[PDB]
Amino acid sequence: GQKVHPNGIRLGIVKPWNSTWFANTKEFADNLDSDFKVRQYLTKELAKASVSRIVIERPAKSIRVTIHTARPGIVIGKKGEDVEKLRKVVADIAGVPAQINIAEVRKPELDAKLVADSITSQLERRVMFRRAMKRAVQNAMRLGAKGIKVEVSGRLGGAEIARTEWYREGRVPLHTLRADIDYNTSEAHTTYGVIGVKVWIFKGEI
Amino acid sequence: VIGQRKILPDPKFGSELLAKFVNILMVDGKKSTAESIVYSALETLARPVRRNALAMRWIVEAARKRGDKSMALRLANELSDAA
Amino acid sequence: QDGTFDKLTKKEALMRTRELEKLENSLGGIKDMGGLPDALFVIDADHEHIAIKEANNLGIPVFAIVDTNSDPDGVDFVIPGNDDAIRAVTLYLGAVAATVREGRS
RNA sequence: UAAACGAUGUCGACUUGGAGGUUGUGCCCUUGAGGCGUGGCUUCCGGAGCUAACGCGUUAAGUCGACCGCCUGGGGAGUACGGCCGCAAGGUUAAAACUCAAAUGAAUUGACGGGGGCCCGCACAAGCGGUGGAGCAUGUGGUUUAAUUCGAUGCAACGCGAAGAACCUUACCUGGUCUUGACAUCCACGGAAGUUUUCAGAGAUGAGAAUGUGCCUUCGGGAACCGUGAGACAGGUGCUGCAUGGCUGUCGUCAGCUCGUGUUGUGAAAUGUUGGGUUAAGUCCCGCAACGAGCGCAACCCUUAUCCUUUGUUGCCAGCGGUCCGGCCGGGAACUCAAAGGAGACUGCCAGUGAUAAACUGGAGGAAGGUGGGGAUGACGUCAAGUCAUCAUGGCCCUUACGACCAGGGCUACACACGUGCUACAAUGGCGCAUACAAAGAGAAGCGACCUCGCGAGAGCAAGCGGACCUCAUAAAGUGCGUCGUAGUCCGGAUUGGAGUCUGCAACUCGACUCCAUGAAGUCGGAAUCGCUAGUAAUCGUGGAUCAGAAUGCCACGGUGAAUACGU
């Protein structure tokens, strides 16, 4: 490889942790494994809910999983029954009386995960990716983000040869550690090969 | 270009013309042993970085396997022969 | 000013500024209405032919002084005098400054 | 007859310039040139114009006029035939059939370009320490075996995946066994599961014996699980890493890579992205048809150095008190220290050099001097580099089966070829005794103290500690004295034996270490090559990961702590 992951290197910088609990070595592995258990059956059950982040935190023997979604209505449901049923699936797969908080993700096409997911959604629907990848390229420009990069990976179009194309616009100073780079990836399970997508969102300095 | 390293003068006598000598007869970062080597040889006997360095290195470099009681005192004999 | 006050340390800001004011001698000369030039006056036509070329490309009248080497082709209001002997060109400069400063009347 | 060429017919006229050479000549210097003309020839720049462009440009390829010669896609072919000419020698005139869809000019980009320079770099120079010799550790190829599992296999594989192989492990094999399967879901039948059992087997399992039969029981059956029945299906460390994703190494923390707008060009395209310097730097100044911008460089992030503020414990003890004299306790909050925040370093200033500038050279202050130091951070792209065996995945393959379980044994087997090491090969020393000064870490099936036994692996008892509170843990090197006197040795520890000591169902395969006991090979190693410019090489210890147990390996910590640089 060549590149560092922009989000994790800024973990001690403007990018905040999306898993904030303090636990000892004894429960650290169990809590971390419990985090993956609650997360794996939280994104899978909300694959069409525009989930941006799933932040986990354990104040006192009860985790409070807040979900960043651009469409809270599908996650909340009618009068919060969907959060309620998801809550008791988290509550018994995490061992704690968990509760699920919800947060609207304003300006959805400006989220790294959502852009990666949105492109991935309309990528296996048998459409040409040149226009599809520009849609995230174009949409971000009118709504700020004075810097962005949307890279796609191998098996671009029905072919036996892998390709790569990224089509930068704006400025993406990934070397600058206070760049506040929103970055996330996704992969598309197409009938041929696997196509991974990678997007960087430069939401201004600090 | 850059100059050679400046070393503080030998504290024991406050003189710069002895520290460079004790640093090369030194082996394996054992300066403490080095005084046990040369001070017993010195306190009891009673460009400037090219020819002085090279010539004086030749003195130190022949005391590895000469086969006697101890080259700690043999080098004292060698410098006594030199002096 | 407030950049040195709040964001940048004084030393680094002062050096970047110190290396950067070198151009506002030309820049600040043009900000009264963001430029929008309507005429140009050039004292040495040949030595600054580039300006004449851009001006006539934009279809702008040109006020030029040509002596022996430059050409009247690029210019429309030619002033066939010297580009040197600073007294004469400064007299032209004072004259044009005045005659644009009673144009409003 | 010639590339007989300026590849440019002859003649005339007209149309801006600049720089020459050669040869006349007029005026005035009546010195020889001279200064100013004025002709002819001629070389080179360039304007308009012209040209496809290259170019030509008053010696036109401009603008015209007169006349002549010539051309009409490439090849066949300046060939055949005839004529004429010639001493044959050949020349000249000059076809066609046939075939091809081009052939061609000029210019653009960028590719070998074995005609260059320039710059930078422990790359060389200097110096330091080494590897290739040996014994072991590990890894790689090769030999056998059922298997010695698979992949990695120049620099960018070879103490690699594997950061840890007695079974399991482990993907391999021998044997036994199961076929909706050990693992997942769905349908049905039963029994609760669970617990106590035996018997045959190695177990997987099978044949039996007791208890239970728990919450609803809305009376079924669920709530769970187990066994069985047919089916879908499961399952695969199976195969393609040139199908891939993802992730990684690679040139290389090298400095370049491009874009917007402009400009130039009919145009492909060029410019930007250039010289001088300058930087570590496409770092930046100066003149430049380009200005800018993006990723690039720096810096922002972490650590370290000085100081300050805050808090003062489990940390410290400057002052006071006496001390079970030990910060031990009052007590002090000074100081170290601890962790939070700031200040401080910015060529800031000065001198000089340098274009005055960039920049550099030194100095001053400053703890830190010229990005003070070290980390993190790797541009477009480079290797169809590697991974399908971490995972995901396209296709392919076996579904009473390379599937699966179990037991066993493999994976560590050698006869070698080489890495990577450690042990070292000792008298800057080794052994014996007193023997001081570290940091950094970890500890609950745990670090485990004291004491006792114990030659020790150690064992028994068992305080404390989930921790600036106790343990790991006496750090060695170092110091003082004595001693060993070149002895293949007091070094060195392989190898081999008795017994252990711990871990586990179980260690011989194939654990570690020790008590005791061996005690060889190794006295510096071949061309060659590797790493290194400061707390750096070079030593010595410390802890941690993985880990029931299993570090010469890895990661991190400290102590002691060097020498060299003339330059490309």
Side-chain angles (χ1 to χ4, degrees):
Chain A
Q2 294 180 0
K3 318 293 177 308
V4 68
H5 194 120
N7 311 326
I9 190 166
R10 278 163 199 73
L11 263 185
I13 300 90
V14 304
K15 298 288 94 175
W17 269 275
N18 54 6
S19 199
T20 176
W21 39 263
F22 178 97
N24 279 112
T25 311
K26 280 74 176 175
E27 46 260 62
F28 194 95
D30 291 331
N31 291 1
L32 195 64
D33 186 74
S34 283
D35 292 332
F36 166 69
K37 299 288 94 176
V38 307
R39 267 151 163 162
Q40 156 194 336
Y41 290 164
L42 190 47
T43 305
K44 183 67 180 294
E45 294 173 353
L46 291 169
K48 295 310 190 183
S50 299
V51 285
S52 296
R53 286 165 55 172
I54 284 166
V55 183
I56 305 182
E57 64 184 1
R58 324 176 175 262
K61 67 182 291 294
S62 66
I63 76 175
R64 292 183 291 113
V65 181
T66 180
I67 304 170
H68 297 221
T69 45
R71 293 137 48 179
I74 187 167
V75 176
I76 289 282
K78 34 179 178 288
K79 305 297 163 58
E81 87 286 16
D82 285 349
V83 165
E84 182 65 26
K85 65 177 71 66
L86 270 295
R87 157 169 37 262
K88 65 181 182 292
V89 183
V90 169
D92 62 358
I93 209 177
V96 298
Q99 65 182 357
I100 294 180
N101 306 327
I102 302 300
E104 160 65 31
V105 176
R106 283 82 64 194
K107 180 171 70 69
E109 68 274 16
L110 274 297
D111 203 52
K113 177 66 174 174
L114 292 193
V115 162
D117 266 1
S118 80
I119 294 160
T120 314
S121 72
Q122 47 100 21
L123 201 68
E124 320 167 6
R125 301 194 325 223
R126 300 265 53 79
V127 305
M128 185 64 72
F129 64 93
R130 65 177 64 89
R131 65 178 64 89
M133 183 278 288
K134 300 289 94 175
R135 296 296 87 193
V137 169
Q138 304 282 336
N139 281 31
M141 295 298 102
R142 279 83 66 192
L143 283 71
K146 62 92 175 179
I148 193 185
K149 175 193 188 307
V150 176
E151 158 195 344
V152 301
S153 287
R155 308 290 288 282
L156 278 182
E160 206 152 337
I161 318 288
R163 293 182 183 174
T164 300
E165 62 179 274
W166 39 280
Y167 286 67
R168 180 183 294 144
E169 70 275 16
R171 63 185 290 270
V172 192
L174 281 171
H175 269 66
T176 295
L177 300 182
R178 51 163 154 91
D180 186 74
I181 291 278
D182 201 348
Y183 161 84
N184 208 322
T185 62
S186 288
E187 87 194 271
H189 291 87
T190 308
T191 70
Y192 63 92
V194 176
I195 297 163
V197 304
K198 296 161 142 142
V199 305
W200 299 254
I201 306 193
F202 173 42
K203 297 168 160 103
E205 285 274 334
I206 197 164
Chain B
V1 301
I2 63 168
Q4 194 52 257
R5 217 165 284 275
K6 277 74 177 175
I7 313 308
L8 286 90
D10 167 32
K12 309 297 289 185
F13 288 165
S15 83
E16 193 273 332
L17 73 164
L18 191 149
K20 188 59 66 190
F21 302 75
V22 307
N23 288 33
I24 76 160
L25 68 94
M26 183 177 177
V27 64
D28 281 278
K30 299 293 95 179
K31 179 67 66 65
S32 178
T33 286
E35 288 97 12
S36 300
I37 289 277
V38 70
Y39 282 46
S40 67
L42 196 149
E43 317 303 325
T44 57
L45 62 84
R47 295 197 299 172
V49 302
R50 265 206 176 271
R51 77 278 191 190
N52 312 79
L54 284 197
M56 183 278 288
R57 285 195 186 97
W58 309 336
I59 294 305
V60 160
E61 283 297 325
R64 67 181 293 271
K65 185 63 92 168
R66 88 175 58 191
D68 214 353
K69 154 174 298 284
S70 278
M71 283 73 74
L73 192 144
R74 297 289 95 73
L75 60 88
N77 301 352
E78 268 205 16
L79 61 84
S80 286
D81 303 343
Chain C
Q1 315 314 98
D2 63 358
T4 66
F5 297 157
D6 82 327
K7 297 289 104 170
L8 282 74
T9 175
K10 58 162 75 79
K11 334 285 181 58
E12 294 294 329
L14 62 83
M15 294 182 286
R16 47 98 184 178
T17 310
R18 156 175 61 101
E19 195 161 343
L20 188 153
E21 69 275 16
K22 299 296 183 181
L23 188 153
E24 300 61 25
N25 45 27
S26 65
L27 192 145
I30 319 288
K31 212 184 185 180
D32 305 351
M33 73 291 291
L36 324 175
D38 194 72
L40 193 144
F41 170 67
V42 65
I43 52 174
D44 213 354
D46 59 335
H47 199 270
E48 183 65 26
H49 176 75
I50 313 308
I52 299 169
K53 188 173 182 286
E54 293 180 354
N56 52 65
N57 175 27
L58 281 72
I60 302 313
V62 176
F63 303 148
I65 297 89
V66 303
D67 171 56
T68 46
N69 47 7
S70 48
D71 54 342
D73 291 331
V75 310
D76 53 347
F77 300 106
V78 58
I79 318 292
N82 261 336
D83 65 359
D84 48 337
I86 185 59
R87 56 92 178 173
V89 293
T90 47
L91 188 153
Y92 303 147
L93 287 146
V96 57
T99 195
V100 302
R101 292 296 172 266
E102 69 275 16
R104 283 91 54 191
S105 306

